[model samples]
Target chain A: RMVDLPVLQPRLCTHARWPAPIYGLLVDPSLPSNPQWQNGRVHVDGTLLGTTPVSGSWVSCFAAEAAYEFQSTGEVATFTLIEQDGSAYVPGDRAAPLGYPDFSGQLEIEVQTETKLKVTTFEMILGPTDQAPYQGRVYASLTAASLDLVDGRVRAVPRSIYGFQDVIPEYNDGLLVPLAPPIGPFLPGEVLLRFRTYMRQLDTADAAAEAIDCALPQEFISWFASNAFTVQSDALLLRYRNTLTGQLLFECKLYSEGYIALSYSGSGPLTFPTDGFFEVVSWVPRLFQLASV
Target chain B: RMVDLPVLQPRLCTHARWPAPIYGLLVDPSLPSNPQWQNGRVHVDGTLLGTTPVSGSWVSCFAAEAAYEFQSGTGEVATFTLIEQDGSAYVPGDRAAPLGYPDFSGQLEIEVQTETTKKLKVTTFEMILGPTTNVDQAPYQGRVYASLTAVASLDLVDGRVRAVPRSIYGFQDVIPEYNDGLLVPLAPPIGPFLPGEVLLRFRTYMRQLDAAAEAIDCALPQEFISWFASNAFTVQSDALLLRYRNTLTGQLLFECKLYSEGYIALSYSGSGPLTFPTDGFFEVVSWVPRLFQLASV
Candidate 1:
């Protein structure tokens, strides 16, 4: 059920049909009670049924979890993955303006949930009359959510093995699970590859030195526009296929050493799973913000 | 109480001291004939004690279950927290330049025994090796990090920083969605603490697992020098771990595992007399203390 809260009225939520939220709950009491999901976003093969502003009420959380209600705008154009400066395209925003087909109608969106890193398959069977031509079976990648299926977030960077060695614990929607099952050794022909993020404590530290309250804000840099090419320094082998299916689920290589692995010789090609999990280390950016009354 | 084998010389003995390792039948049935655990290192407060660099000396499978000869360096200190390190990457090569040894069973904290041990103590942990290739098990990684979080202009007395945890909360993830920060509203004006230089002690445990194969995660960055424990571990000993305790009344304030990531908090409500953390890690205090915070604040 949708949470009963004041903000949820014209509420914009952080849930997508595919993959999971990097930091929100996926199940309940929290799922039911608002939880923090460690799974980040998954940009994959999908259709941009439409677009809305960051403050748009089109994708309301108050509606059915997956239902989208739209008002008529104009004739639909073939969607292309292009970037517009004022367009709010990040998936988190739920309004991708990047190469949008600009369809304005009811969209029966489909999300394929089963894949290694949790593949997100998208389908926009815009069933309303504002458009009739946008119909079926057009393959996964063609309707792929590219503008570069992007993680417009952090990238994995090389980490040390000796001093930096530590195993990352497996986490679920909320609490801990048993230890991470050991998935030993790197696979054959694997090379270690790590990514990094632009995380620094940021904020105007002193709002009211006499305000009696304090909070530190950290800035997590974001990409205005991104996809496989725009998001990675080393372009990811972003597509997955199995000749067995008409439309393939998005899949990618990259084993996680079952646990977090530190950089060491013969460390094997290992990094976080496609889910985008990584460790944070370094001096505190120290963008301390506090006040006292 | 050890096994008899050919490869064993001086031969067949790590047969020394207190803390022990899992052995045959106990470790695994086939342990008498074969065992693993050497080259494994033990650490405490950032100091290395020793290493069992070779295998077969720590466990066995051919006959008895296994050996448990784990011990600590001699010292007459008041408190001791011994940890084991065997989580290094074991990459095979001609040398150790970059290719590190694999201690698939890593990230474990043996135990925290408080009291003067005539410069001697022992602890034991089940031998955790590859059961699944996905994650490793416990290694040396246990600490009640202050987050080392600091604040300025706090009340300090005699070089000791004075402070009191007025409220506390925890967020499970970096980007939280709920008010999981469920702040523990401290008691009125006079909090559990007497508003003086603070003294604190955090005892940790792995929060009991449903199955030994499971484990929790530590907060990021702060405890990144982490140790991982796999679900394959057959031990069930992590529990009632205290993150904050009152040395005065032997009362623990909070019980949270290092693996369960989140903000550290202090409870203002308690039973019995308002006993302060009379001893342990002396926390400095000041009359004009400012707020000290973690993560968000």
Candidate 2:
């Protein structure tokens, strides 16, 4: 699924002047949001103190800082109904006034739901300090639609979770947790699970960086080439022995497909990532036989 | 018959620093002599280089090269050519010419025997002594009679020698002839020689029999037999290929064969992780040919 927004404007101050301009706007929500603002709009209309070129599109926040100053009267930037605290609110819409002591601008907000809202008027002074005079205009409006909020606080989504019950505990401390089975001179076996997609080139560096975020053991960028990928068999062999006679007992070989999800279900030291889903898709027991000591 | 020669000395030079002595004397026709000196009598009375040491019987044959010096004297080591003659030519006198050096020394000129005579001489050597240097050189032209020839006590009565042919009943054409009036050929002068004709007949039959006997012995050890009787051995041919079995179970133990020229080979096939007593033992066997039969076929 792709997200598209038809009216998303982003602005930047150029040349240390009073009113930074709304450089340009984006309509595609999937293109990515900018820094120093979230789910909000900003507008600017003030005279320039010095002449400088403007790109009229998204510039880095650092570039905006270098191009504009906040001391000119009647010059201002505004945020309205910004997503926060399980709701969206205008800049100064509290029951009691809360802001710079000489704040003399008006704010009007409308709470649409307990966690969603809209704004009609949003204004603030972008000025020479001591609250003498104000000039310029900037405006924005937002809604809390995709934020993960629980009890008015931010929380993270988990990848997977599992449990085990009614198994004999092999290693014991005070807590009742079972241990993994022993094999040969080795410790209990380990399962290596992997999930991969097969794209080599990306459209933009930010899109590429944001596209390649996960809790896999390491990045596999080298594993893909020119949109092509192969699912090779990655297998592990477990060797067992007779503890009494010190002779070979058997060997067990296991395999898995590249795209399938996997889960560890046994009384063993199986570690799982805290923020990703690990639902098993397939399970196979390949071969077990007597081999070497 | 053996001869013991006592007082036979060998000498060497230790640290050649003295007038070393050539010690002893004897004049007897009984002792065997070589080509150098014989019938010797010599003594040396000399001063010692150092007072109290003697180089004893044997020492390294050198020193600083000062021990033995040749002094001015008309003396020499001697040689005498000796020959034996059959009693075909005889001079009937008071004392007969015995088969010694002086007996035939002046009478025979020691000439090289002709090829025909040498061939005749070779037969005498071959038929009487099995084979010797003279018989090996029957085709050469030099010195055939004057070398070491043990003709027994027969004298040269007429200087003409003739050989007698003898034969045995079985292995008829394969028997070796004997001459010089002896029942069997004397041992070759330089050998422990077996007659060629006798070697051939014994080898032909022994090859076949020995092969079978060896394979049977090798394949039928006591442990193997007990195992085989209870478990039964597998056979491929009526009398050729056989395989042993384990007594505890009916498993094939080992496969073996007896070849046509007397050789036995064995092999086994078993996968392991095998438990003890069942694993049994492993053995390696070797064989080699000895004259006629394989020693450990």
Best by lDDT: 1
Candidate 1 chain A: worst 10 consecutive residues by lDDT?
A213-222
**Model 1 per-residue lDDT at B92:** 21
Model 2: CAPRI class: incorrect
Reference contacts preserved by each model: 0.00, 0.00
Model 2 chain B weakest lDDT span, ten residues long:
B198-207
Once fitted onto the true fold, the runs of candidate 1 whose alpha carbons sit more than 4 angstroms away are: A1-118, A121-293, B1-253, B256-297
lDDT of 1 by residue, A147-229 (tens): 22322211010100111101221112222332212222333322222221111011212211101000000000000101111
- For model 1, residues B232-255, the per-residue Cα lDDT tens digits are 112222111223334355444333
Candidates' TM-scores? 0.16, 0.11
Lowest summed lDDT over 10 consecutive residues: which window, candidate 2 chain A? A56-65
